[PDB]
Amino acid sequence: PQITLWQRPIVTIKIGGQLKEALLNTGADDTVLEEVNLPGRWKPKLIGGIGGFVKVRQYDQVPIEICGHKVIGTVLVGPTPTNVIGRNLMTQIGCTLNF
Amino acid sequence: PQITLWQRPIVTIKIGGQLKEALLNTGADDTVLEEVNLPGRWKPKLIGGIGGFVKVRQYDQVPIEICGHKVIGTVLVGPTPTNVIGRNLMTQIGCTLNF
């Protein structure tokens, strides 16, 4: 786990053989990570949309471990001010908002 | 409630005598709402920082009801692509991430 929100909800993840940190972001539809070299197929995707769009590489069905939970989901790879775990992967780990 | 994340976590809020909807956004430090006329004192605040800054009005200790929970917190008022409830108000309502 139960994560209170007094601080930014940053968690450890394992992706593409690397250990990284990312922000659990319920405001983000998608997961965007930078500086990961993923194997297998990808397609370009345009995201954002304020001031223009940002092009990232979309990798589907990527195995990823998030705070000890081994799951699968789409990961967008490209430049991002902060590594973000979006709703698409929070659903996979069974993460809910509770109050 | 327990809110799953398959859809965007949009909730009803009551602010400044108006009913509005806003997104529960764990990636946002602050709460930003547009088209509200709040009474009492404010100061300008610069937020964002990508491409420049956005100037908003900071109102402290604003009474707000969020999905039935009457709380108090800082509300930034200015144009925002989507009304956002940030961590500052999620802590007030006792909202946690759970998995």
């Binding site: 954002g48 | 956004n25 602050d30 937020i47």
Partner: peptide, 7 residues
């Protein structure tokens, strides 16, 4: 910071 998104 402050981070929503739409794909």
């Amino acid at each position: 910071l402050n981070f929503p998104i739409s794909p």
